[PDB]
């Protein structure tokens, strides 16, 4: 298989993505959810971890770590501490609105994912750390969890398997940083959402100091479909090391901004011109695309023509796949205003723990605020580049990286527009 995309509706994992079917238990059981869950759980942890490792599932949260290799870190004998699957439903990334759709429209798929993943990792309970802004989605998921407790699908003797497993929902309180897994762990523990340093990875010391795996809503909700359909079925999509399907959020300057489930290595132009109705003003009106939400660097129109929407082809396009949140920016966009508003987001959403993010993201926001007006001299472009390189890899979590990278992409692909901004400032003010 050399061409990708054009995913059929029989291959969709997230049927009822759009809210057109019943999200409750009667609607979910007639779409395939909770089918033979007892038979999956009674095949033990090793079979489920083998199905996830065989599927080539990489972490849908945005980093793309191998999910079965990640979840096998819990597969070890206990030492008195309980074990916890913690589901990352925070989703603070600008551009990203897919986990909201999973929680709002396919909640039992997430609950069965919690059960299957927690059985795979020996977890006692599931904390679904949901965004506090998603109040309707959290009450929606709580109604589904009540339907799962009353059907005997979770809790004491889950699905008739003799495995006891609770599913808790924890609401956030308005922090983007509480999507990061250790800061999310600190936020569940009743503290400020400040990221822990690594090591200890959360499989050693996680929530309450227990063994813990934090996993995205999307990489959890696909796991019972992987265990039913087979790992080879999931691995038959996308390129190699880029297996499966993916939810995409096309937003910004397209005709039809939408969430859509697509095969992994689909071209960006095919995705936009098929599911989004194209760029406003046609494809020739395209200026730039932030491929995967705010933390990934932008790519210009010449790179968007041939690139594939998986992890490896976007790393080769010197950006990241990220959360697969495609923000489209047409030729009428002030791109420095957009990237500076993005860096303004990153300084309003930065917890303040370590020095390079706490100081340098505010200092990058001040430099970007002068760059929008042109109130600068061109030697401050390169300086800002080095400022980004002083934040990148020097911080605790990757929010410092996620604030350095849009600056780097903007400079790398749009230095002359910055320079002409500054020189027209210099000629109209001096």
């Amino acid at each position: 298989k050399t061409s990708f995309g054009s995913l059929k509706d029989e291959d969709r994992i997230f049927t009822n993505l759009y809210g057109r079917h019943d999200w409750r238990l009667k609607g979910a059981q007639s779409r395939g959810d909770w089918y033979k869950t007892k038979e999956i759980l009674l095949k033990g942890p090793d079979w489920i971890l083998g199905e996830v490792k065989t599927s080539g599932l990489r972490g849908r949260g945005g980093a793309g770590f191998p999910t079965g290799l990640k979840w096998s870190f819990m597969n070890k004998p206990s030492d008195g501490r309980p074990k916890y699957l913690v589901v990352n439903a925070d989703e603070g990334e600008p551009g990203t609105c897919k986990d909201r759709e999973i929680i709002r429209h396919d909640p039992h798929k997430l609950v069965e994912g919690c059960l299957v993943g927690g059985r795979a990792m020996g977890a006692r309970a599931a904390y679904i750390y949901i965004r506090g802004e998603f109040y309707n989605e959290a009450s929606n998921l709580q109604v589904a969890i009540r339907e799962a407790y009353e059907a005997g699908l979770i809790g004491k003797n889950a699905c008739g398997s003799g495995y006891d497993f609770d599913v808790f929902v924890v609401r956030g309180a308005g922090a983007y940083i509480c999507g990061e897994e250790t800061a999310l762990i600190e936020s569940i523990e009743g503290k400020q959402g400040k990221p822990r340093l690594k090591p200890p990875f959360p499989a050693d010391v996680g929530v309450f100091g227990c063994p813990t795996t934090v996993a995205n809503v999307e990489t959890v909700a696909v796991s019972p479909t992987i265990c039913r359909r087979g790992g080879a079925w999931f691995a038959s999509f996308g390129r190699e090391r880029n297996s499966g399907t993916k939810l995409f959020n096309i937003s910004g300057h397209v005709n039809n901004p939408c969430t859509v489930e697509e095969e992994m290595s689909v071209p960006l132009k095919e995705l936009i011109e098929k599911h989004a109705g194209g760029v406003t003003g046609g494809w020739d009106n395209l200026l730039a695309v932030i491929p995967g939400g705010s933390s990934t660097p932008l790519i210009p129109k010449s790179v968007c023509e041939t690139v594939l929407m998986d992890f490896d082809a976007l790393i080769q396009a010197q950006t990241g796949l990220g959360t697969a949140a495609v923000i489209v920016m047409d030729r009428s966009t002030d791109i420095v205003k957009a990237i500076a508003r993005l860096i303004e987001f990153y300084k309003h959403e930065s917890c303040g723990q370590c020095t390079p993010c706490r100081e340098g993201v505010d200092w990058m926001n001040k430099v970007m605020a002068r760059f929008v007006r042109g109130d600068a001299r061109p030697a401050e472009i390169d300086s800002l580049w080095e400022i980004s390189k002083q934040i990148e890899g020097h911080t605790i979590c990757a929010l410092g990286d996620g604030a350095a990278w849009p600056v780097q992409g903007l400079i790398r692909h749009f230095r002359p527009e910055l320079e002409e901004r500054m020189q027209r400032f210099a000629q109209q003010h001096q």
Binding site: T355, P356, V361, S383, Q390, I396
Partner: protein
């Protein structure tokens, strides 16, 4: 013995498992720079001044928090270790106030000294600096929170050694502030020791304020008599007048702290 072998700049050293990178470099006589690490407080890892290159690793590690794995070669003086130190010192000094003449910490400032030893000689910060509202935590500790570099030694001392739980961080990002959030008075029997471990002049001694300056003081090593603990102290004088009383480290008595009556 189950000692693992690590390397500091190629020099082999046998360390106990669980030892951090900073302690392994301490064992060869190298002192990694630090602001939030303190050997009598818990590990914070939030100033990033101790970032050091492990070779064949494309990312510096917080040496105060990272444990040594067997076979690491800690490059305490490689080029990217020094670039990390200069970058982190640049961010520490970006919003820091130009108060070095009017600051009691001047001459005995960790921030000044390892700005001289490990950071750049000049500035690229062409912006306006933040200014933090001061706090009132008592008659012993003068509080000038613009000088704060958010190392949280306040909070770890007050929580872990003094056992008080009144200091904390409010806010988020660059607007994050250290304080009690209310008009509350931090009066422990060990409250003046936060003057010692604050690396900057954000917490200073209100009785000692402005009177002396560290290079001109003479340091007489002596004994506390305010109790029968027998704390080891430095009576620092100047021209025949007692200026202040600092602690001496004695591991078996007063580890490096003194009481407020002693101070």
């Amino acid at each position: 013995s189950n000692l693992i072998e690590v390397f500091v700049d190629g020099q082999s050293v046998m360390v106990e498992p669980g030892t951090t990178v900073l302690q392994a470099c301490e064992k060869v006589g190298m002192q990694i720079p630090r602001f939030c690490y303190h050997e009598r407080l818990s590990v914070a890892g939030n100033c990033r001044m101790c970032l050091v290159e492990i070779e064949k690793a494309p990312k510096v590690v917080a040496a105060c928090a990272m444990p040594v794995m067997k076979g690491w070669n800690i490059l305490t003086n490689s080029e990217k270790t020094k670039k990390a130190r200069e970058g982190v010192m640049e961010f520490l000094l970006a919003n820091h106030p130009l108060d070095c003449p009017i600051c009691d910490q001047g001459g005995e400032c960790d921030l000044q000294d390892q700005s001289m030893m490990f950071g750049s000689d000049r500035s690229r910060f062409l912006e306006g600096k933040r200014a933090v509202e001061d706090k009132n935590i008592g008659p012993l500790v003068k509080t000038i929170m613009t000088r704060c570099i958010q190392c949280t030694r306040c909070i770890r001392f007050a929580s872990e050694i003094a056992g008080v739980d009144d200091l904390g961080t409010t806010g988020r990002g660059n607007d994050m502030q250290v304080g009690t959030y209310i008009e509350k008075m931090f009066m422990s029997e060990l409250s003046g020791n936060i003057i010692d471990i604050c690396p900057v002049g954000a917490l200073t001694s209100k009785p000692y304020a402005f009177t002396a300056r560290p290079w001109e003081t003479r340091k007489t090593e002596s004994i506390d008599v305010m109790d029968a603990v027998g704390s080891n102290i430095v009576v620092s004088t100047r021209t025949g007048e007692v200026m202040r009383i600092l602690p001496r480290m004695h591991e078996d008595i007063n580890e490096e702290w003194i009481s407020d009556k002693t101070r």
